[model samples]
Target chain A: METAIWIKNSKLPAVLVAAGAFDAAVQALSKQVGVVKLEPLKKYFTNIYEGCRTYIPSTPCELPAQLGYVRAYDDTVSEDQILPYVPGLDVVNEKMNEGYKNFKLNKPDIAIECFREAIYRITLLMVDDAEDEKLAHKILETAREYILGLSIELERRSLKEGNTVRMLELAAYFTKAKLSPIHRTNALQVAMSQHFKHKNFLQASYFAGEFLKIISSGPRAEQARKIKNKADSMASDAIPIDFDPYAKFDICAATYKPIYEDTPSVSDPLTGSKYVITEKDKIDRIAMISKIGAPASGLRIRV
Target chain B: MDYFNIKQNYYTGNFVQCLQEIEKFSKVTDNTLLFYKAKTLLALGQYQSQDPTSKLGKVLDLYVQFLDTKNIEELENLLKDKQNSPYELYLLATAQAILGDLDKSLETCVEGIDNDEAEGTTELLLLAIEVALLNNNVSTASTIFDNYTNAIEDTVSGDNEMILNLAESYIKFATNKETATSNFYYYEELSQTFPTWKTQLGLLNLHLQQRNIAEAQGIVELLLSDYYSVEQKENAVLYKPTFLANQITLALMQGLDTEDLTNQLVKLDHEHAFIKHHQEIDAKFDELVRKYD
Candidate 1:
């Protein structure tokens, strides 16, 4: 109901989050619809994030309820000399650690659920603390890549027939996030072909046109051109959808509809998923869990 | 008179800065200018074209010749004249060890430390302790360590302190004695103070010896991070093979595969120690007929 980013201190879902499960339509609903994913405390280094981080700041926090200073050492500093202890950080960290361990264990379904649940918890935490929020956003962005990576790996191995309509639809949903070029091109190509083979020529034409803009010459491009030409040849059968692949916009991870530039929208803080403002109070279509878009203080997880 | 910077840079493994310091100052005590110039050049492995003129300089030039030709004959001829100086003894003993004369190298180094108490004698003592531990013989090495416990401990504490500290650490480490924690801190302090390729490698070696996978990984990452300037890059270039070898060792220690790292080492140096060792194992594997299909 609220359009503003941050609400007042009196908000909802302070501590507990309902963790849920995954794989297809009912599972996708269970995973993505109500789920608010969080992040882990640590991760393995691949490319780009491959260095040791010796320090993670948990500073300038809300102190103990009662405060008194000895006032003896008279040097004025910007921060409080003592760090405040907060709960739920370890809870969120352990949540993500389980997710990462499952990630390495090749238990993608469990891993996805773990990540989703962690994000849900993190979004509710430290929501009012701006400094902590920066760390929250960073952790979210890193986990975003993992969700993208793991989902694609699942999609790649899906059956050639009888079992992947949900997978194909999920591929279309993936184009919402401004992801790596490798992933964007992948989403574009998968979306184009999913409609192309299913005889939804107009939908194929929309994706083909956008796909062509990203990559010029490939096997996928040839199919895209074929689909666009076919869609043009049969104007009556090719009913257009309210989708524009070319414009710079974020597709709602929920409805797969575009949230165009400078428009009012809400995002799942950790998942980097944008949605129609009215599409709040449901699972984020990315990592699955409880309460998709809700107001909170800030997301804070230290490195 | 300020050989301080030059010696500090050299001992700490900053050969480029050592050369710069030598070139900056005109006054050097005890021909240390020439001693350090030659020593620093050898350390940088840049002595191939270096031509030295003074008597000490001539010996360094011959040392370069020995390195190039890698022959024991010329050094043997020089040793036939039985020099009393530690620098000459260091060169001859080094040649003996490199030529695989372990006992003779220790013997040659042994001849110097008992009689000589001067600049560079610490090197001879360290070398004696080192060659004793070459095939990792702790008994002989520890005996040498015990013999020289204080024979040269109170010398002027510049390179003497650094060298003596290294020798004691080497002996203790090779014996797997109770000095693991102490040796680690010694190197940690040295690397923190100097932050050179050598001292960092010393710290890296201690980490590797203690099976510290994570810290050793961080150390290798920094060394090969390629953040060095053109001047600092030379130290990295000189030690590139070593860093790669360290990685392969780490890989093996972790039960991971070593081919990727071994390939890198081979490209850096086709005949790197890992390659030779790999080849030796390969030949032995082929020799065993029951192993092949």
Candidate 2:
């Protein structure tokens, strides 16, 4: 076989974004081989070869053929300027609507297939040139399945290991989408807004010391300084807590869930000493690990 | 090889030149190995110290890319060239070490030594010795360290500072005590010979270890009082705060009363941008101090 060195670059921003998965896949393979038996290594090499083949690059013309461009003045284009093609948005929407309808009747297989198709189409659109309008539409469509998938999985496997894994994966996906940061912050804010609503002191303190470190020290530094001044003026005493006054949100839905299948829901189990998870709940866990020593932006999931 | 020439000029902590070298190397090479080396060099330039404005995120992006690759075949191919100069071999070993394949890293280091790669052989050998120490093969590590010391004599004679530092690090690793402490008199003698940061840091660590607070404070005060430029100031300020924090923690642990130390920490915490914004450190420190209370 003739060998050629190819360094193909993806044009669409989303496709390049998706290529991150390919990079991750390769690294994961490296780790697997770094300490494995020779036979598995051989097979892994073969698998790597096979996986590489699946990444077939489009010819210059083929890309245009696969991803037809719409004009700037198209009416279907959303405020974000993402345009839809007939095969892209329409097909995904049809599948999503079908999945939702089937899911309501509890025919999960049909719902699964439809949801699967929706996921498949979204993945395809990642490579396709649907512009921003169609991209937004597709994201919304994908999110619907994600939401539906969460609901369906929770109902089907309430107490199974798969439920935990699925929830974790969903949370990860939400994190990757950069949507969780705001939700997390808002949740924390709602939890802590009582004592220091007017003061940005904690934020300033954190920014000056850690927030500046976290946010790469441009506008965040200024904002932190401003907040610190506001905070100092508002509070006469040194506040007990420095960062989040309310508390870190622990995923506590399980507390409200029934103890046993036969057990009746009572205030004691559902809302009392057994139920409350104060921020001071006595367990420690490694939260998310980021490679960025400290991010310029806070580690919030922002979409 | 190219990185060395670029590094010789750039290691004076000139980021713009370092970035230019990155661009120069990036334009000429796009292979995985080359890309990773370029990235590391770029990262080392930015983050070998405590520069507030270092583009660490960009460095991390490249690291993430290198870690995420599945094809060992590409890496294997990159290293297959025996014709690769000694310097290239050292660079390759550095990449392997950063990528966390310490075994292969040591193997490559040995290979580099066989090929007469001189640039970073001592560092690599020291790493190999450390690995042996980690696996509890102290006998082997001792033998390896002696072999490395002998090899350094043969290859590049006369008390090489880098090699000496590596040897000292290995001794510390093996013995679980600062080799510099017992050898303080000897180091004090050698300090006149090589008045470098390694020697200074070694002395600093030794004094701190010995509970010689006055002497340690004097050394730190001397360092702090020096007229430093922006880059030097940045490193000195950030590192000094950390060093001071560690000293205070040690003092607290040694049954010392430190209300003044606690106040200094708060002041330093407020002054340093990193500590000012970091809640995690504050929380961790609070957790630790709470135990004492």
Candidate 3:
């Protein structure tokens, strides 16, 4: 039988909460559930100084779009059915609960690992229904968001090394998930920013460049351009030659020495010699010849 | 063969042979060869000029304007029909930005990116981002960054990796000042990998930010040593402007002999037209003199 995943309450409320809005939160939730009266609930309280505020309910609610709350409904399974049978659904749910527990217990690493394992198992299930495929996508989306949130938290806490590791994992997960362009882009962007914060210009620029290729137009494109420019400038800035023209020659001179020639001597024919017969030698030869000439002239006179 | 010989002649300072050799390859339209040709021409022009109003001086001045001017109309005309290359588009965008038409510059960059035949998307995007930042549109800059990262994530390799990392480091630091400690590792790694003026500059900045005056001074000394070590007078001449700039700024920051460095900078400004036109150098000089003089 085919299955369809439907939200009992629209996931819009969670999205609103993520954006840190309480007043719009109930309205968003109400709209998703197809209720009209909740519009008035948007402004249920008035404040003397801050003006009217929306009331928040005291009852705890499960996050929207989570695997636990998302129900599979079809002809065989009624809308009110608590759980629909799918191959290995129980294992997936068990792992998700464990992951959530770990997350709440402040063990994000363990939580991320559990979530990844669950995602991997879901991929392996190979449900025949197309709606099941949709469920898998939704599951991966939530997983990506969870990983991103944990990584961002680590970054906020200044756990750079740990944050870097998580970001790399997220990048890998997105690549494998092949969920959507947006998810992949988000993962790559996070990884790029993480590397950037660590001053890893190589990876940072790589990701920035990659991000630009994916988002060729729109505000995202503009953002990518800025990131890439920052990366490029930083890359250029990191090299001394970009700012200091003399860096090349200075480095060259420091590292290598000029080839020098030894003083030349009068040598064999193969090699040119620097030695030249001097004016003193020429004058000396002339004097000697003159002395010999005197002897010859004297002999001639006697004869 | 003649081109190589001419290039050798140019490098060796045989301006006459360089010009003659260039004439032999006058029909050659290769950008690289043409660039060298222009350099040779500029060199000869510089050598031949006596007074600023002389024929050679006018020719040199025109060349300088062509090279340095921010007037986009002339640049656009010059680059007309030559936008087949990604570099031309980048040049156009950069000129636009320099001329203070940042919106136009960004628009041109977008057009360049849309051209399927164009290459160097990274470089082009960087130009656009620079314009966006200049325009104070941080949101736009961020969006560009997202796209850029996605484009390079899969295929960034070896030397390009370093470029990527450097770029990333700068973006993070620019976006959030609190990431300095995290960025320090990148600087350290880059300094170890390249150890060029670029890395040194980053290190110097980091040290200054941390208030490590001793380390900053050490970097300054290293730069000075590199500047003074050039064997040839002409070789030293090329670096003089930058050297003076660095020295004067460092001296001022360190509370050293500002008067001496300031005089040196003023002398450089008097000697080199390139330095004279440099706004940063001029601004730094003005600031130093105003404070110390």
Candidate 4:
């Protein structure tokens, strides 16, 4: 039920915080390349293309590090780069740092935003280097695939994964879309974990059962049932549907990795340790936090 | 939960299974009460079709009696006040048509048309016209038919089926065969403009009626061979299961390659997961396996 209350009352605010973090990252990346206007980003992208064509026009076309480094420098120094370019990088770095810090802080919502921005910037970088028209289209496709793969990972861990990257691509082509059914069902499982961790089985079962009903007709319903059974076994045989009558923690978990990776300067004390946080440290932190944690707990405090 | 299962059960004429589900639904929730009645009527109708004077006919007689005695006033309230789905209107029209109240039946059909707020008003209105024609109200039927045709002509996107049927109605019902023939040209015009499967089907139906089986079969062959969407492929499979069953029927009649026809059917069957689910087709497939063995 604690989770239910979080979904009903806290999800939007959490999303807003996440969005703010991403916006900061976007602004930071925007500055580094001197992309003042949206149009300049396109032009800078064109220059990068021209640089690619001039420098690496042979078979198995490999972009020379020197040439790519020069393009990166030009993007940074040129007045053609927008007035906000450097500040944009600072903002991105700040957001990424903040996101990483939040993940350590157990602020999954904020962390999700930061990680989203990281992926977003990486995606943009890929887009900038897409010299060919066909390659340019593949940039978004790659981003979509990455987001989907990560979303599946998020499900395995019972967390909210960034699906906006895929959503944005779909929205471009379709009027509307959402996270797949699998994600939604996994979210319910995460919510159950949250509530059951608090011994709020009544609320957990109610939301869990409701989620099962929603997915009953879809391909993932059986999988959802298996998850529900596991949750139920832990809750004294408290069937999810039979739990808290008004229990509400039915919201999806928000991810925080993207914002941190995107924003560079922001300190992530959880991973930072006043030392360089390796990929191994981040993975360890994820494994531990996913197993058990109160959202109310903070990583910096624990550290 | 499984519309495919329901459709399959319907295809095999499993009225008992359908009726049991309908009855269960009716008991579980009042939302399906109308569906319950429809299923009951449908079961009786099926039984009547098989043997008119058997126990099935007796059940139908009792069901009809119960239907008539039920307060029309209450049903009307559900219709006018509750504003239930137009499907309710369709059910009421069917019920009244069965009850031998021609005037009431025609009135209900018109009511169904009047209440329709969605697209396909032309088709709905045409159905009402058909009901009126059945009652021998020629003037009312003719007026409605003419209005529907005018609506079709003025429509930016006319209903394809409606247009085709209008042409057929003109040929069969109208005194002037030349005028009917002129409407046939509209099919050609539509084919030129939209080039939908429906236009192709209309052309094929025309050709078949004229004993131009070669031309009809050629179109079917082309449609079968062409790269259709997943949904369109499923539709083609269901639209004529017999065509899928016999390669010779398609090849000899349409001059299509036998192997290609078989390949298309196999591919379609595989993609749709049809053989695993549909029993009739599964039997056909099992027979093919026997031949191979």
Top TM-score prediction, candidate number: 1
Give model 1's TM-score versus the native structure.
Answer: 0.47
Candidate number achieving the greatest lDDT relative to the actual structure: 1
Alpha-carbon deviation at A119 in model 4, angstroms? 82
lDDT per residue, candidate 2, A1-303, as tens digits?
000101132222122222223333223322321111122122122221211111100111001001011111222324333321112354566666776577456565665566544543343342234264545354544443333333323443345653433432232222221122322232222222222342434433332333333343464346544555555565433233222323332222223221232333221110111112332232111111111111122111011
Q: Candidate 3: which stretches are off by over 4 Å?
A: A1-303, B1-65, B68-74, B80-83, B134-139, B156-159, B176-179, B226-260, B263-293
Candidate structures ordered by TM-score, highest first: 1, 3, 2, 4
**Candidate 4 stretches greater than 4 Å from native:** A1-303, B1-107, B113-123, B130-143, B147-180, B226-231, B241-293
- Tens digit of lDDT per residue, candidate 1, span B162-183? 6666677766554434424676
Poorest 10 consecutive residues of model 4 chain A by lDDT? A59-68
Root-mean-square deviation of candidate 4: 30.6
Q: Write the per-residue lDDT of candidate 3 for residues B56-140, one digit (tens) a residue.
A: 2333334346445445555576455654454456656655655557788788887776664244455456556555655545567
First chain TM-score in every candidate? 0.43, 0.27, 0.29, 0.26
- Give each candidate's interface RMSD in Å: 24.3, 30.7, 29.3, 35.1
Chain A, candidate 1, TM-score of: 0.43
On lDDT, the stronger of 3 and 4 is: 3
Q: Write the per-residue lDDT of candidate 3 for residues A156-214, one digit (tens) a residue.
A: 44545544444443342333223245545755666567556566565567777777777
Q: Model 2: iRMSD?
A: 30.7
